[PDB]
Amino acid sequence: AIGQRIVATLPYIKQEVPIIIVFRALGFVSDRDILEHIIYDFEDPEMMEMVKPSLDEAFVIQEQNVALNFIGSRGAKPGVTKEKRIKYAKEVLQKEMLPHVGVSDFCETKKAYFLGYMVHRLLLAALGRRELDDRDHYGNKR
Amino acid sequence: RKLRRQMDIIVSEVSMIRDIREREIRIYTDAGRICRPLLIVEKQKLLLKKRHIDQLKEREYNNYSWQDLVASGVVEYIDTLEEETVMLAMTPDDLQEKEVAYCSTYTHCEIHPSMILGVCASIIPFPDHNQSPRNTYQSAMGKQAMG
Amino acid sequence: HTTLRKVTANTAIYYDPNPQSTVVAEDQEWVNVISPWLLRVELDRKHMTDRKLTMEQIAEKINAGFGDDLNCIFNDDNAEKLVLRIRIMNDDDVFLRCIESNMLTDMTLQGIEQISKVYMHLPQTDNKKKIIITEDGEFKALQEWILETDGVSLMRVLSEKDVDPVRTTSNDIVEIFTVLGIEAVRKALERELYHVISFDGSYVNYRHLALLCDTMTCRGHLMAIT
Amino acid sequence: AKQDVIEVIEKAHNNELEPTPGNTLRQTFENQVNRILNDARDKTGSSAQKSLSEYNNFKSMVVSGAKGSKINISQVIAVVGQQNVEGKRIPFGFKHRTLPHFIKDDYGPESRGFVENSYLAGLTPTEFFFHAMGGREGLIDTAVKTAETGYIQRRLIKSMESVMVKYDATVRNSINQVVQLRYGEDGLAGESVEFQNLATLK
Amino acid sequence: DDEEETYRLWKIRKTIMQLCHDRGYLVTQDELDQTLEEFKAQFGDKPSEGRPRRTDLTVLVAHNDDPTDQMFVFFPEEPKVGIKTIKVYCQRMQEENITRALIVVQQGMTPSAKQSLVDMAPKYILEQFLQQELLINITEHELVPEHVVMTKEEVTELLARYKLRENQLPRIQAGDPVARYFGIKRGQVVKIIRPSETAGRYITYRLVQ
Amino acid sequence: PGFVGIRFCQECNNMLYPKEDKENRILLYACRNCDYQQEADNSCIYVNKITHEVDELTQIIADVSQDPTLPRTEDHPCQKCGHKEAVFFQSHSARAEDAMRLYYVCTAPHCGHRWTE
Amino acid sequence: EDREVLRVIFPTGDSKVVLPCNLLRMIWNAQKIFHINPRLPSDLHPIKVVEGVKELSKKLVIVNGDDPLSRQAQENATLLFNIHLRSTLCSRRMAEEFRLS
């Protein structure tokens, strides 16, 4: 088929969501602007051919609020209106995902950088540029 | 490293880890990070000197304590993440001398190897002469002895 | 089992508007010679020569598998490069990449399915060695070639030329039940059960193994002990 | 043997090592390294065994078979050996090394679990930690094995607890379905038989 | 690809000849072990659109004790045979005075015709086999011991000797390849002779259910 | 062969998609969102290297010479500046199918030359 | 005829087998109870060996009965032991190895 799509299981949401929808809902209209948070060097094609099948999954949404509704439909408390799903999904993106990067009036660019770092960190292991983390490594314990 | 060895701003518990191949550089400040103290090694020589041992041997008069030894920039606290990006030596005599060269880029040394043991395993005499499932059974039966 | 992915080096698709136009510089196409979007694959010599394949066999497998919806054009086995080109005879070109993936994942160029890795060695143990009887009534352990696998089909295997259909055991009891029957399952179960006991060198009497294999098979079906 | 490890490593680094058929380069390198180390341990063990006197008290038990084995004497006197985890050597628990006292990408004997010291000579601390890591695996397997073997025991018994030899000398279950027509397909009990040799065969 | 199909049909015919000899139908030693060359010369080497096509190579045989009960086989041309392509065969059955036969299909049979084979079964006790199934005489394998079909007068003597009922025996299901090989209904017991490593030879009795 | 690179719409900054001009029979890249189109210069669209013979030397970074944990030899001097110290290490990569090749990186900073023997 | 039966029962020929009473040890006990001295010619007539083994094989019953279904099972149940017994209580083997009276 197409192969190797990227999704994002995020809390208080019943179903996984493709990451491009998450960056569109998070505040980024464009595609190059989304891609600048994930692939830090655009002259690497091997990143590009792996990142494009999840981009081609979601060229039907190009604006923020439709992606907000796409999240809020999947919500644990599914809103009945268009403007209740948006408030629920905006609450989730504001507070539920990634508290450690900031919960404030505007922390969307910083949360976007950390999420793009997570996607980049996934792509490096899927390409074998790095190695997988060990669960028993007691540096990773507290 | 210059600041943490002087305790200017960065307290000793904070860990700095530079990953080189992956360009990331992390700093951790949290609670729950397990760490142990190590000596510091410049070019091939210890930062610990005769004068430190002399000032600290006549403790209870000078009170040149462990904390003054930390403050001098002679020991560090190293946790597990920072222990991956570093090169240690077991014994400064046998491992920092001219020979068929192994590393010659050491960074730290250990104070004594017998500080890898615990409490109940630190009462076993000659434990490196036993088979290792015996040291476990003695580390269990040391909690059951009468005294 | 061998797919196209084992032998191919890389795959690149071009949109070449005329088949004679040849964006790739290959004179073999020019002497060799309707849709413009084409697929090109480079194989490698090593896996091709290890398994002894020819591009005629491969193109035959494509034309058998997909029919005459599409035509392969293959290099003769003389040049350093191992190229073949693919068109589609007359949902535009994502279909081409889709059938690329479907063609890569499974074609069975050689081999049979579910058997992924097969080994070869000469057996040292006398039971695994072939045993005959000579003219003077000796036993004369023979050291012939055997070959062990990593998957199992056992009925597509036995139904082949030059494979011994008397001696091939298959380590898998449900399959022996499907193929050889319940009385073969009792003997095979006994052998696979005695093997793990005698691997330590310990001994257990035939009484107990025989009774376990009997109670486990005395109803015509596999009575698993659960 | 330790020099023969290093020359194999040099043949591996300079791409001078051809893979064994049926194996990858990694597994054939591992096979050759473990071959040198096991042959070393065996030769040192045999030298130790040749060294012992008639009046020895380790030999007094091993020859009698009362306690110990021929590998224990070698492992007390000569060489402990290589410590293994899941059949392989000591794995790279750190980033491409084992302990922070070793250079990265060190496939040597001392860096991966081989103990060139005996129990009489004591262990170096690296070797001590590796031997603890070796003993831990068997100490785990002891505790893990019991809760499977007892369950297999009980589950085997519940299928066959009513199977007995009747006065027909046949073998039948609780509902008199016949399992064997003679017990052990000979009628004979297991505690009165022996090993013998068929003379007329071969 | 005609040498492989010729070799395949030769092994099919050879296994059917061993099938009919083991079952009891009278077949000669000439057909029992012929080489590939008698097959190739006597059917014609070209299975693709040529002389050794199906249906006019199909075997009919007769039982040894009387030449009244007769056993066809039929090798259909279709990969997946159907009801309309077996009622032809059943018409050949009712055309003759014969009772039963084999059908060696090429691919898997359709379920509706399998239910058909179930339905006229007490009239005509016929059955099928598969092509992949029949490229090996599985009786020749070393795991498979010697199976013998018991006569009813011997079954009565068996049950009288050990003083036990017909359901107390060990049993065998009708669908496994050995009982399907000999071809036997339920309520019919089978000797199994096998070598014992403890005491010589051992006979047991499986009842078809 | 080479590797295909994604190019972007100038107008709305989205991924262009390949498409065939049937009339001129020419490959063109077109945006889904806006009508902007472009002529293809490469004519290669999807390339997939399955044997995946990869050059690790593109991925190696010169800063790795600052790692204390890594070994170094003076047996192999630098190819560019002829400096003796070279820090060496293995592939350090998963799916490096069978490789114990040593990669050498030069010390003595701002050289950064990287080679394989 | 028994030798070929063993060769078909035991492919990959291994003489080691499990059987009730150790005949070699029992013969060697008989040699010490009765003071054999195997340097002298034997008193035992070799037809008595044959008709003693044939009678002993009658005495060793597993399946009782006389109908031919029981006799086949008695023959099969004692098959390997009777092969071993006829193979070690020969007339040649008693007359030239064990020298029993």
Ligand SMILES: [Zn+2]
């Ligand atoms: Zn656009």
Ligand SMILES: [Zn+2]
């Ligand atoms: Zn340089």
